[PDB]
Amino acid sequence: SCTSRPHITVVEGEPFYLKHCSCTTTKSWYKSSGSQEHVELNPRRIALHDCVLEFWPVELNDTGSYFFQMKNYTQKWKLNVIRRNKHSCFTERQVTSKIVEVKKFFQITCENSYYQTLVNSTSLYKNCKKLPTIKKNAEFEDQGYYSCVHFLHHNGKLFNITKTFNITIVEDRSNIVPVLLGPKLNHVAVELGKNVRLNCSALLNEEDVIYWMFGENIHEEKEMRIMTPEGKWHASKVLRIENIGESNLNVLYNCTVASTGGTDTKSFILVRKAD
Amino acid sequence: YFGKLESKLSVIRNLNDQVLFIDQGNRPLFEDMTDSDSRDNAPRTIFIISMYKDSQPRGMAVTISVKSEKISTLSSENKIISFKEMNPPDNIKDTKSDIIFFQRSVPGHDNKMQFESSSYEGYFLASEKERDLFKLILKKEDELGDRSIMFTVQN
Ligand SMILES: *[C@@H]1O[C@H](CO)[C@@H](O)[C@H](O)[C@H]1NC(C)=O
Ligand SMILES: *[C@@H]1O[C@H](CO)[C@@H](O)[C@H](O)[C@H]1NC(C)=O
Ligand SMILES: *[C@@H]1O[C@H](CO)[C@@H](O)[C@H](O)[C@H]1NC(C)=O
Ligand SMILES: *[C@@H]1O[C@H](CO)[C@@H](O)[C@H](O)[C@H]1NC(C)=O
Numbered sequence: 001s002c003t004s005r006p007h008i009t010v011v012e013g014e015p016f017y018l019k020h021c022s023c024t025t026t027k028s029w030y031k032s033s034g035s036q037e038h039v040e041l042n043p044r045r046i047a048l049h050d051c052v053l054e055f056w057p058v059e060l061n062d063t064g065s066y067f068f069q070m071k072n073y074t075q076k077w078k079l080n081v082i083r084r085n086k087h088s089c090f091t092e093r094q095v096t097s098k099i100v101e102v103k104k105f106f107q108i109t110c111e112n113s114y115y116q117t118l119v120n121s122t123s124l125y126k127n128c129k130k131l132p133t134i135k136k137n138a139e140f141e142d143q144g145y146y147s148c149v150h151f152l153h154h155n156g157k158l159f160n161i162t163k164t165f166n167i168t169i170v171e172d173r174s175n176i177v178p179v180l181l182g183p184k185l186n187h188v189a190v191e192l193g194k195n196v197r198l199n200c201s202a203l204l205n206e207e208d209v210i211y212w213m214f215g216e217n218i219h220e221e222k223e224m225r226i227m228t229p230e231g232k233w234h235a236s237k238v239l240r241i242e243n244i245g246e247s248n249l250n251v252l253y254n255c256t257v258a259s260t261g262g263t264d265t266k267s268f269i270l271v272r273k274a275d
Numbered sequence: 276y277f278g279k280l281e282s283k284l285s286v287i288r289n290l291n292d293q294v295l296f297i298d299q300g301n302r303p304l305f306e307d308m309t310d311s312d313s314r315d316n317a318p319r320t321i322f323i324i325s326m327y328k329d330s331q332p333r334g335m336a337v338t339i340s341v342k343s344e345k346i347s348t349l350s351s352e353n354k355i356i357s358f359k360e361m362n363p364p365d366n367i368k369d370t371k372s373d374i375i376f377f378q379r380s381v382p383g384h385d386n387k388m389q390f391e392s393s394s395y396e397g398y399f400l401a402s403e404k405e406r407d408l409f410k411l412i413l414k415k416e417d418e419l420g421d422r423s424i425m426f427t428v429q430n
Contacts (some may be wrong), residue, residue: 003408004304005296006319009311021407076299080315093311096291099386099429165312175385209280209335210329216276216366256332260380262390263332 001113007078011094014084015152015159016058017114020068020075023051033064037075057159089128090147097166106138108165110148115161121151144168176232178204178257180264187271192244198268200255202235203228208261212239213254244270276374277367280297282325282413286313286429289310289402290422293409296320297341303349317393318342324378324428332388334377337361350374351392356400356412359392359414376400387425399424 002021010016013194021107029041029048047054051070055062060114063081085091098108110132124131124148137187145175152159181201190196202210211220222238237255248271256265284311285297293305294312296319313320323340339349341364347358352373361372369395381387390400392413401414401424416424 003314004408005297005306005308005316007312009309019407023407046407050423082311094309095311096307096309101386128381144400155377173385208334209326209424211280213276213328213330216278254330257328257330258335260335260378261385263334265332274369 003077006076006161007080009080009082009093010058011082011091011162012058012060013083015059015115015154015161017061018055018066018077018079020051020070020073020088022070022073025070027051029053029068030067031064031179032067032232036064040065056154089125089149090145090162094162095145095164095166097168098137099168099170100142101170101172102138102140104138106127106134106136106142106167108134108146108148108167112161112165115150115152118154119150120153123149125149125150138169140169143167147163157266173205174231175261176203176205177262178202178208178259178264179212180255180257180266184266186266187275188268189271189273189275190244191273192246194244195240195242196244196270197242198239198253198255199236200239201234202257202264203232204235204257205259205261206233208233208257208259209236210235210237210255210257212237213256213265214239215251218242218248241270276330277327277369277372279363280328281325282323284430285322285324286320287322288427288429289409290425291402293402294320294429295322295411297343297347297358301343301347303358303367303411305411323363327367327375328368333388333393334379334411336393337378337390338374339390343354348374349376351376351394354386354395354398354413356379371395380393381425384425386427388428389424390426400426402426 002019020218030038031041060081068215079176082093122132127144145166147162147164150161219239225235228234252267254265254267294308297417298304298317316367325338327336329336340346346362348363350359350373352359358374370383373394373395376390378388378390392398397401403410403412407418
């Protein structure tokens with residue numbers, strides 16, 4: 001892989017790398033800080049090799065923006081280094097959230113496809129208590145921070161790399177395929193001088209949407225939502241047409257319910273009186 | 276006719292929980308991010324999903340926008356994913372539009388969404404690895420149940 005995003009936050013004390021997404025040619029790394037315009041990096045804990053920039057480990061020293069150039073190629077990163085929680089196994093900013101539904105497939109797996117050849121030991125923590133994988137169907141009490149830790153050999157002393165997942169166990173919605181209530185085709189009676197009010201009604205979900213479709217002043221709308229005794233959302237919407245001409249006469253006015261989960265639509269035709 | 280209804284802010288992720296964002300070059304890409312990375316790369320991580328009414332309703336019709344420096348709307352023009360600098364319009368007088376997509380949840384998993392292109396029937400927003408990158412592209416479906424055209428939509 002490689003690191004494509006403009007901004008990046010990592011925790012103090014931990015090994016870290018920056019990989020420029022283009023891979024005996026001329027490379028150049030540069031650093032900006034407060035009063036340092038572009039300090040070309042030429043380190044004699046930082047290592048420059050084969051199109052990557054390594055920190056061993058990264059430090060507060062290192063927050064600032066970084067720039068890479070390979071002839072026709074250029075790249076920019078804002079690097080923000082943060083303080084590590086020294087009393088715990090992880091630090092709250094460095095956490096990655098996950099949502100997993102109650103009775104459902106749930107996995108957590110410790111991996112690194114970069115530093116893997118240096119790894120000597122890798123332990124998994126739950127809320128900082130040791131326990132490499134967790135394969136499982138979810139329980140509410142699987143809510144927690146799972147921390148993956150990796151212990152590394154690098155030229156005389158020990159490093160660790162730690163990633164953490166905030167797992168939230170979520171209740172599942174009772175989601176409904178929205179339905180329209182009533183006949184799918186409808187004939188409505190009215191008189192030319194006057195007005196009609198068409199009501200359209202549907203069973204739908206919180207997120208669902210109910211609307212009218214005419215051609216797009218003598219028209220208007222407005223919406224209402226009430227809960228049924230079986231816990232479902234009952235929604236309705238009225239379309240008003242004021243001084244009916246014949247222009248309003250054989251045209252289909254479609255009311256629709258549209259959901260991420262499905263749709264239904266029903267048409268209304270305006271007729272004079274004789275049927 | 277397509278016509279604009281409401282909007283939500285959202286954070287899109289792929290089959291590996293890689294976050295969608297717009298890069299310096301206006302290219303939609305995917306990358307691992309902590310919550311702090313997803314928060315601090317905003318506005319490039321925050322996508323506006325705007326909903327539309329449709330005369331021939333095929334799902335949830337939507338546009339996708341971000342605000343980089345200006346606003347940009349995702350297009351499928353010439354079967355290629357790209358960001359066009361435009362605002363999602365009040366309305367669209369066509370049956371298929373390079374900027375309209377149909378959002379449908381994936382049966383059995385309500386968290387997962389597929390985005391079918393309205394201009395090209397059968398084609399779906401997808402995550403592809405191209406070399407060292409992870410890219411949002413348009414593709415006709417490979418396998419059946421292909422996880423690469425499914426996404427999660429959070430906040
Ligand atoms: C490495 O992790 C160990 C045990 O989890 C912890 O005691 C130590 O603070 C960590 N080292 C660094 C440099 O953060
Ligand atoms: C973990 O989840 C809880 C519940 O949503 C949230 O309030 C908390 O901020 C999360 N922790 C982190 C570090 O984001
Ligand atoms: C529309 O119909 C619904 C369901 O039949 C009903 O509860 C509601 O009172 C009606 N609304 C108006 C404004 O007439
Ligand atoms: C929906 O309404 C349009 C215009 O009002 C009409 O032409 C169309 O045929 C209707 N759709 C269906 C599926 O009947």
